[PDB]
């Protein structure tokens, strides 16, 4: 109930005029009181529509101001959207900044004038510095200045931070006022005509610099900001990658005293094991050269910060480094050209001096792995292999974005990238032809996409036809099935929904053991991803072909084989200005259904091939090997204790043993630590990488202004947990400014606190971080029933596409490929089912969601609706509440710290209860209905549909299930078995969890099976109503925990819930109408 006050002050601050008026609107769930609210509303609207003072009535109707609930505030004020300058003249008395063109390697990557690089606007492109975000610089500056004004009178350590950031913003604003403000278009892009007389790379630096200075809480932060802001104005290609590089060595210097362990994906079990740090001499010399480059770049304070820590090499002072390690990824992207980003990868040194004894072994291991993967399904003749075509045709929605192609649905034209729609287009003209695999050559080279991530290189993406997916699908899914239980496929091992977060290193770390960890991200254009890899797979297919008797399967295999033939020679469309290059690339990269797991395989085979050479000189027991995409690590234990000389000689031998296969590497050997893209360990303590740029994005998504605020807040929460902490108030200011909407030149709308933090499809953040907030009142239910009434919408584009000819053809081919003679009973069901996966197509979502926003807007303006009894969550909590009883408790300290970078209160929680140990099927994958879905498809279906589907009669369930590609015999058998009744509870668990972000964010990190949490929750057991006792125990846990978070102390509980209300609620259970947005979730592991 505080956000809105800051909103009011922002409104008062930004406009400031007599003519600037401020117009609240309220609502209440009580009829009489609502009519008085309507009255107040009316009179206020009138007064607003008559240039009358509004401030007088506000006292008379004080009751509405105190007890009624706000929605939004409008603002009518005359201005020509400037105001930044009109405030800013005072805050700009520092010195402006001068570029240095001889910093970046290229010439055009310097921050020189646009016209000196793009004289004509017809050849201009802002994409090499496009922020790619629907939020203005003016918004950012306005937010900063209002923040600065309000935090101008606090007197504490907070003020010492304020003076620091104030000095920084002076340094910034002097530089900005030197030239001026770039002006946004409707799309928040910046055209040539504003930047025409200004430096090209001023905007991203500006935005990134704002992002940095808003994340200053300490003295060392101020040092970092002063040392980066002035150097990030020039270096834009070798900076975050640079300073973030020494960390990989630093982790190998901290003696472990106390450890954390894995068994199964979150089984934590601490260990007091001690391990020393046997560092060689030459890695220090490597580090010194890196520091010489660091100083050569213009760095003074950060060598000192790296130098004064080494006197002790203690882990208590070490988080500074970790803090620093996240500041490298909050400086921005190196948004260079597709070409030049490829040429970071497309430099090759291929030699006829490597072994042949090695590649054959490599190929064989790949072959053997393929056979291990594919022995069972190829042999037992699974339906999904026979009907691979239909399988891929269902799983088109889970594919990549194909190249743009011109379609027409009756009487329109569309440029879709969705490959299912491409197939639909090709069906009409007789072009659907999955048996004839297209070539990939001079006559038809491939387009590209770029997978970026700051502080690292750019990876590439194939953009293929629709046959390749179909070919790779079935085989790769069976491979995945094999890979669910194989440990070494780290990206693919699971307990059917999890990826192993905290590694598998710490079991056997010791004074006698070592670990070799290695980045393999440049190994895409390499000489070991060409011919042997593919031919090994082809050989494996030959073996598998001789390991089966069915003919459909052999057809599939021969087509997949020929696909691998075509992928062995593959050319690549790449523009450069106007003309187009096509380059010989007969090798492997990302952008495929096969690439990820296959790269994991290939790296596994490669390292297995490398690993047979240390054995010529050392005896070790391979305890573990791991591969996850762009890195891999193997730990090994010896017959004796380790020395410096053995590590050095092993390292040189490893480097040269990669050199024998013509393979570059920064080889890294250690005893205690690793560093990889997504996480890293030092001294038996897990840290993480906080690298998500906020004001600069990777690529241009499809979301609105609205949802990008929610994703940015989710990323904020994540980065905060990682360690990189930004001031939450700034984020809130941005959220209000991005959900604010301009209806005219002078009308602007501003939503409120109780709309963005309320459980709906529009939730954005929370009033108290790490805690969803609920509604004990009528009013949150009331507006939720309204928004649920409005969430269900239509897309006329989808309606007319489903009424076209291509849709009919598609349905006909589906039918005659599966079954016939129920042309008016199921086929309509199948059309309705295909609709469920047309909605993946983005413009449909835009139509639907913009429609949702318009419908939303026509009741944000005007008063409220009673919404007709539709039960939701807050009704339940409203009814559960009057049977509680609180009591003061006092818990002890019994859990060990292993995530220092958390806030100390979060750690206090962790230092009193446990960390999570399971991961519940948030999508119901282990459910026996889903083990059918995972048998005939990969598709998710969302928990809205499932939660509804189980509630229906036994008739339309049959139609709905048969419509999903499933045959009739197994569906009938499923209905007879009655396992869905054994799955109401799992589905409801997943439903409530998805609604309440229990497996998404801070609550994803917590053990609800704990004994420590349970002894406070003294809810006796009744039985034969599982839903109630489940939800009661859960809600009570949340109550105690929220009380703990906000107040520190603990409490116990008690709920003698009457059986009468149990029965009254049992019928209210399976008619709930609620929903949470996918875009609001914040996965700590991305």
């Amino acid at each position: 109930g505080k956000y809105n006050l800051i909103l009011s002050e922002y409104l008062s601050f930004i406009y400031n005029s007599q003519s600037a008026v401020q117009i609240p609107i309220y609502y209440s769930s009580n009829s009489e009181l609502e009519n008085r609210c309507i009255e107040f509303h009316s009179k206020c609207l009138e007064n607003s529509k008559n240039g009358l003072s509004l401030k007088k009535l506000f006292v008379e109707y004080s009751d509405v101001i105190e007890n009624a609930t706000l929605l939004s505030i409008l603002s009518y004020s005359y201005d020509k959207y400037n105001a930044v300058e009109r405030k800013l003249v005072k805050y700009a008395k520092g010195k402006p900044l001068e570029a240095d063109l001889t910093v970046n390697e290229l010439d055009y990557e310097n921050n020189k004038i646009t016209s000196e690089l793009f004289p004509t606007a017809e050849e201009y492109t802002d994409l090499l510095m496009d922020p790619a975000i629907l939020t203005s610089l003016s918004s950012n500056l306005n937010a900063v200045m209002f923040w600065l004004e309000k935090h101008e009178n606090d007197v504490a350590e907070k003020l010492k931070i304020y003076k620091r950031r104030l000095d920084l913003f002076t340094i910034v604003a002097s530089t900005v006022n030197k030239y001026g403000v770039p002006r946004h278009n409707a799309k928040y892009r910046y055209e040539y005509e504003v930047m025409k007389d200004k430096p090209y790379y001023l905007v991203t630096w500006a935005n990134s610099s704002i992002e940095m200075l808003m994340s200053v809480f300490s003295h060392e932060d101020y040092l970092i900001a002063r040392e980066l802001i002035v150097l990030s104005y020039s270096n834009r290609s070798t900076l975050a990658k640079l300073v973030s590089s020494p960390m990989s060595i630093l982790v190998a210097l901290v003696d472990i005293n106390g450890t954390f362990i894995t068994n199964e994906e979150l089984e934590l079990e601490f260990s007091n094991k001690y391990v020393r740090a046997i560092v060689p001499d030459q890695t220090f010399d490597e580090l010194k050269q890196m520091l010489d480059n660091m100083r050569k770049a213009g760095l003074t304070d950060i060598p000192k910060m790296i130098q004064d820590w080494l006197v002790d090499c203690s882990i208590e002072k070490f988080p500074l480094m970790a803090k620093i390690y996240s500041w490298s990824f909050h400086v921005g992207f190196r948004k260079q050209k597709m070409l030049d980003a490829a040429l970071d990868q497309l430099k090759t040194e291929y030699t006829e001096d490597v072994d042949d004894e090695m590649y054959r072994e490599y190929t064989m291991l790949i072959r053997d792995e393929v056979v291990k993967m594919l022995e069972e399904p190829v042999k037992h003749d699974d339906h999904l292999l026979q009907d691979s075509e239909l399988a891929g045709l269902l799983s088109m929605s889970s594919a990549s974005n194909g190249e743009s192609r011109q379609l027409k649905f009756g009487r329109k034209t569309i440029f879709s990238t969705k490959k299912n729609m491409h197939v639909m287009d090709d069906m009409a003209n007789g072009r659907y032809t999955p048996g004839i695999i297209p070539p990939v050559n001079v006559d038809k080279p491939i387009p590209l996409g770029r997978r970026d991530v700051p502080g690292r290189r750019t990876r590439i993406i194939f953009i293929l036809p629709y046959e390749y997916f179909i070919a790779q699908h079935a085989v790769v899914e069976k491979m995945l099935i094999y890979a669910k239980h194989t440990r070494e496929y780290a990206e693919f091992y699971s307990q059917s929904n999890q990826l192993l977060s905290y590694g598998d290193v710490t079991r056997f770390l010791s004074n006698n053991s070592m670990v070799l960890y290695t980045d393999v991200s440049q190994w895409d254009s390499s000489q070991h991803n060409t011919q042997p890899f593919r031919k090994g797979i082809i050989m494996g297919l030959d073996m598998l072909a001789n390991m089966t008797n069915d003919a459909r399967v052999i057809q599939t295999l021969n087509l997949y084989k020929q696909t691998q033939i075509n992928l062995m020679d593959s050319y690549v469309q790449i523009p450069d200005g106007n003309v187009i290059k096509k380059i010989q690339y007969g090798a492997v990269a990302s952008g495929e259904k096969q690439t990820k797991a296959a790269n994991s395989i290939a790296n596994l085979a490669l390292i297995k091939t490398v690993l047979s050479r240390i054995s010529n000189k050392y005896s070790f027991a391979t305890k573990i090997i791991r591969v996850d995409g762009d890195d891999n690590y193997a730990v090994l234990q010896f017959n004796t204790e380790v020395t410096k000389q053995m590590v050095q000689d092993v390292s040189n031998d490893v480097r040269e043993t990669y050199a024998r296969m013509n393979t570059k590497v920064k080889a890294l050997v250690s005893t205690v630590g690793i560093e990889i893209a997504k996480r890293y360990i030092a001294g038996g303590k897990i840290f993480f990488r906080a690298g998500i740029n906020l004001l600069n994005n990777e690529k241009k998504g499809q979301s609105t202004q609205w949802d990008q605020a929610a994703v940015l807040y989710s990323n904020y929460i994540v980065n905060r947990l990682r360690g990189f902490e930004t001031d939450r108030e700034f984020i809130l200011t941005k959220i209000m400014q991005m959900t604010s909407v301009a209806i005219t030149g002078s009308l602007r709308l501003f939503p409120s606190e109780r709309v963005l933090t309320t459980n709906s499809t529009f939730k954005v953040f929370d009033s108290e971080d790490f805690i969803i907030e609920y509604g004990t009142t009528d009013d949150e239910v009331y507006i939720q029933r309204a928004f649920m009434s409005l969430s269900s919408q239509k897309s006329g584009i989808a309606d007319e596409i489903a009424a076209s000819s291509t849709f009919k053809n598609y349905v006909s081919r589906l039918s005659e490929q599966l079954l016939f003679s129920k042309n008016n009973i199921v086929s309509r069901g199948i059309a309705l089912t295909e609709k469920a996966k047309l909605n993946s197509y983005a413009p449909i979502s835009l139509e639907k969601r913009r429609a949702q926003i318009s419908a939303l807007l026509t009741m944000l303006q005007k008063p409220v609706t009673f919404k007709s009894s539709k039960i939701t969550i807050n009704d339940i909590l409203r009814d559960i509440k009057p049977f509680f009883t609180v009591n003061e408790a006092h818990l002890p300290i019994q859990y060990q710290k292993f995530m220092p970078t958390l806030p100390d209160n979060v750690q206090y929680i962790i230092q009193c209860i446990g960390s999570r140990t399971y991961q519940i099927e948030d999508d119901g994958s282990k459910s026996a209905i889903s083990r059918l879905i995972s048998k005939y498809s990969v598709y998710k279906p969302s928990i809205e549909e499932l939660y509804k589907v189980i509630s229906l009669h036994e008739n339309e369930i049959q139609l709905y299930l048969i419509s999903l590609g499933i045959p009739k015999i197994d569906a009938d058998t499923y209905v007879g078995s009655k396992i869905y009744s054994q799955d109401k509870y799992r589905i409801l668990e997943s439903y409530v969890y998805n609604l309440l972000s229990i497996n998404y964010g801070c609550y994803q990190l917590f053990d609800f099976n704990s004994p420590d949490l349970e002894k406070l929750i003294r809810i006796p057991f009744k039985g034969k109503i599982p839903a109630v006792t489940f939800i009661l125990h859960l809600y009570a846990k949340l109550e105690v925990i929220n009380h703990a978070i906000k107040n520190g102390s603990w409490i116990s509980l008690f709920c003698n819930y009457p059986k009468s209300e149990m029965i009254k609620l049992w019928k209210k259970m399976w008619n709930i109408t609620s929903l949470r947005s996918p875009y609001t979730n914040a996965n700590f592991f991305q």
């Binding site: 054959r360 054995s615 010529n616 005896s619 305890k623 017959n639």
Partner: protein, 99 residues
């Protein structure tokens, strides 16, 4: 020399050392490679000519290494090896194979 991959094949398929640990634990073959056979051939010859005592450094889990070491100790005398490593090798063999 013989191509390594054949021997890799037959060991790999008949042993199933993939299977013969815990399945959730790490086990596989070890170096059959070239530039070790001749390395050994040089090491052995130069040490026997020089009468340089040489030691063993192994892992007992890889019983194939020991199956080759017993051949080695059979053919090569025992006074060339320091008694401690020799005894270790024989003792693992006995406690593993013979008794």
């Amino acid at each position: 020399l013989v191509s390594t991959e054949a021997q890799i094949q037959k060991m790999s398929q008949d042993l199933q050392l993939e299977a013969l640990t815990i399945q959730s634990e790490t086990q596989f073959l070890t170096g059959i490679n070239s530039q070790a056979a001749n390395d050994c051939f040089k090491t052995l010859i130069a040490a026997m000519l020089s009468q340089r005592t040489m030691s063993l450094d192994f892992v007992t889990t890889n019983y194939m290494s020991l199956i080759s070491g017993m051949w080695l100790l059979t053919v090569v005398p025992n006074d060339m090896f320091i008694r401690e490593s020799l005894v270790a090798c024989q003792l693992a063999i006995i406690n593993t194979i013979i008794y």
